[PDB]
Design a protein around this nucleic acid. Structure first.
Length: 400
RNA sequence: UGUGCCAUA
């Protein structure tokens, strides 16, 4: 802090005016000090004369290097966001030059700003506040190479991509969809703590749900094709994604979303079907298997049920079947729990059984009888486990 | 008995 602004005991004075600071040339020193920047932020919320705005515009967002220094600064980034707001709210003659300048500064340093812990907020702020045409240019400044992967999996920058998806029309960021759909890229991003959320946010945006009813038909077609391209890559590697610690969340989202029913069916027969016993014993894929059971169309549900009850050859020595393995498996037990709950909901009216021009109630009745018969017979061993006790209880609960 | 992310003074 400048000595002219400090008192005797070394504290920033109290009757300090915004214009004093703007006239002094010492703003950069204020903006990077906590007390200083705190004063500036209160002061810029108030009434501002045309000249005060003019000075703030030149000093905070007028020169590239001071703009970057403040944007990447723990305190300064708030002053930058605030001055950008004021700039956008000031329809004077210098408006245009001012916003073009801002777009040029950011575009030129896009990657480094997105990866930065503080300047990422400046990017996100600009994306939703700037005129859309200019905001679109910022997106255009995103990298198209390895740096893009790095952006998607970064703890800060991932929020920039999610913001883009939220506030910029698809046409401008379609390159991101196609970038992420390339096999090697899909693998790295989906298998990452932050990347898997980015990919889900993208899928959600590409979904023709009640949030997208505002789109023109032309826009819908654009969305549908981008969705098709991304889903194709997801279905071709879905085995790998379902079994992954992070990417299983994406597959679950797809499987559990009615507005994605066509891709739900694809996934089920592409990697789940015929692998149900195997996947039900996987830490991560078992959650996907539950989702498939909960949301499968009745025709596919019948095949899933049949595969469990009769799709596998019992152990040649003991006679343990699929159901035996799963009921007692550390992960598989949740799947059988899931199967039982589905049937109990169906036969008690808590779940619609009518689908495809037919009432499948007799099918649920059949499956329930199989499960009840197994639980009855194995009730003593099952009593030893929480899962088994829960099943016995579920059946007991149904009787009454 | 079984998994994540949702981030600034």
């Amino acid at each position: 802090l400048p000595t002219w602004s400090l008192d005797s005991n070394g504290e920033m004075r109290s009757r300090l005016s915004l214009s004093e600071v703007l006239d002094s040339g010492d703003l950069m020193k204020f903006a990077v000090d906590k007390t200083g920047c705190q004063f500036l932020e209160k002061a810029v919320k108030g009434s501002l004369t045309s000249y005060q705005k003019f000075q703030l515009f030149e000093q905070v967002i007028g020169r590239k290097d001071d703009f970057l220094k403040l944007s990447t600064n723990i305190f300064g980034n708030y002053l930058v966001q605030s001055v950008i707001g004021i700039s956008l709210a000031t329809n004077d003659d210098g408006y245009t030059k001012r916003q073009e300048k801002l777009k040029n500064f950011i575009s030129s340093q896009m990657t480094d700003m997105c990866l930065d812990k503080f300047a990422c907020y400046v990017i996100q702020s600009s994306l939703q506040n700037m005129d859309l045409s200019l905001a679109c240019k910022l997106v255009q400044a995103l990298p198209r190479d390895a740096r893009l992967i790095a952006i998607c999996v970064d703890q800060n920058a991932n929020h920039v991509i999610q913001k883009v998806v939220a506030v910029i029309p698809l046409k401008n960021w379609e390159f991101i969809v196609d970038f992420v759909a390339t096999p090697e890229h899909l693998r790295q991003i989906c298998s990452d703590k932050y990347g898997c959320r980015v990919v889900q946010t993208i899928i959600e945006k590409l979904t023709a749900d009640s949030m997208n009813v505002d789109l023109t038909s032309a826009a819908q077609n654009l969305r549908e094709r981008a969705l098709q391209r991304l889903m194709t890559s997801v279905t071709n590697r879905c085995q790998e994604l379902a079994t992954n610690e992070y990417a299983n969340y994406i597959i679950q989202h797809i499987v559990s979303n009615d507005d994605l029913a066509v891709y739900r069916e694809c996934i089920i027969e592409k990697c789940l079907m015929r692998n149900l016993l195997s996947l039900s014993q996987e830490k991560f894929a078992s959650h996907v298997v539950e989702k498939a059971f909960l949301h499968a169309p009745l025709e596919l549900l019948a095949e899933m049920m049949d595969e469990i009850f009769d799709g596998y050859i019992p152990h040649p020595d003991t006679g343990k079947d699929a159901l035996d393995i799963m009921m007692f498996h550390q992960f598989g037990n949740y799947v059988v729990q899931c199967m039982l709950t589905i049937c109990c909901d169906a036969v008690s009216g808590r779940r619609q059984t009518k689908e495809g021009g037919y009432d499948h109630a007799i099918s649920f009745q059949d499956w329930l009888k199989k499960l009840h018969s197994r639980v009855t017979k194995e009730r003593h061993r099952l009593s030893r486990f929480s899962s088994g006790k829960k099943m016995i209880e579920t059946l007991a609960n149904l009787r009454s």
